[PDB]
Design a protein around this ligand. Structure first.
Ligand SMILES: CC[C@H](O[C@H](C)CO)c1ccc(-c2ccccc2F)cc1NCCO
Ligand SMILES: CC[C@H](O[C@H](C)CO)c1ccc(-c2ccccc2F)cc1NCCO
Lengths: 207, 197
């Protein structure tokens, strides 16, 4: 049976406390997850800029990692963070992303201060909590691109032709973000996003 | 929980199973026309048993063995240079192959070394492993496991003992652990060993 945590449960497991007696007191995740960082440098190759930070598979180890990064880390533009299921690289060329795409939220300059941290955490909860019912199996991961022009947050899914999975992910995600129903989010095939065709990329789906 | 694969398991996964660590394969060469950083090339990274074997099977089919060249597999975020923050206080267990041992032992010992790394073969003391280097040379090839701290005797000697076991070296063939700080100093014909097994 799928391990599913709602938003309230994940939030109550936060701040630590549990003794983890018998190694049996932590709350297991459905999936193991890997946190990645990708910098920009004096042309290091794409592989040399992509770094694995940490992996986890309990609610408590998620929060120790989240609380740590929140206390310790700086927010540099040009950088990207990704949380992906164990064994999927955060690159669209990966077997599990090549046929896929992303549900994209773009924030303007002003919304860095107000919405970036909030929307990123809400995104992470959706992933580790298995919030999309059977369609959570279609999730690969989520990416945050920290940029001067405006930040991007996206959930990556495995198959852009699975309309029922994709649209359900998008509905629940927009709901969990608490976006106004007139803020429309768009799902972009990685194959279209890889092609630079001018102004904007095509949306396969919108919610 | 720690991800440990014995030698039989890794061999049966060959032609996904996650590795404890992500690993980076590097290529380097002693050309003078170019600065050291121009000679250090990053080939690929991986973090599953299957992606290790796709990379190993590829390099085994495709690549040529040129002397003067070095290959290195290091944990993600450690450069294969003794000046790195994770190698500067460290050293290496060293296996020198003589000229005839190239044809017979280089490929075998290099693979057995790689299995020790990706499989986490040293129990808690695999956290002390930084990587492994192969120096392909005319005089005789060198294979070494690099560890992070030459003063961690219990970690170092356990690595050395399990490594010599996994290489199937006879107990008469003694391997030596050399601090990077001594190996950086040229003091004559060989370097001092901090430990021996
Ligand atoms: C520098 C902090 C960075 O900020 C983002 C861009 C906005 O929030 C960031 C990156 C990764 C994670 C992270 C942590 C645990 C699991 C998975 C993760 F992606 C958390 C944070 N920061 C949260 C608090 O600001
Ligand atoms: C010439 C190929 C070279 O040969 C060594 C020196 C002796 O063996 C070499 C280098 C790297 C790797 C390698 C591949 C995947 C992950 C990590 C690695 F270090 C494999 C090989 N050779 C395999 C076949 O012998």
């Amino acid at each position: 049976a799928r391990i599913i945590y709602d938003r309230a449960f994940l939030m109550a497991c936060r701040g630590g406390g549990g003794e983890n007696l018998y190694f049996q007191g932590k709350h297991p995740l459905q999936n193991r997850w890997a946190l990645w960082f990708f910098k920009n440098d004096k042309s290091k190759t794409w592989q040399a800029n992509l770094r694995l930070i940490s992996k986890f598979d309990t609610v408590e180890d998620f929060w120790a990692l989240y609380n740590h990064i929140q206390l310790s880390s700086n927010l540099m533009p040009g950088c990207d963070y990704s949380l992906f299921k164990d064994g999927i690289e955060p690159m669209w060329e990966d077997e599990k992303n090549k046929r896929g795409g992303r549900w994209l939220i773009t924030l303007n300059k002003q919304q860095r201060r107000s919405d970036l941290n909030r929307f990123w955490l809400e995104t992470l909860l959706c992933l580790i909590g298995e919030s999309f019912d059977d369609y959570s199996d279609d999730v690969c991961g989520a990416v945050v691109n920290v940029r001067a022009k405006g930040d991007k947050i996206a959930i990556w899914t495995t198959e852009c032709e699975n309309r029922e999975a994709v649209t359900h992910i998008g509905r629940v995600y927009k709901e969990r973000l608490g976006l106004p129903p007139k803020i429309v989010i768009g799902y972009q095939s990685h194959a279209d996003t890889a092609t630079k065709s001018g102004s904007t990329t095509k949306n396969r789906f919108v919610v």
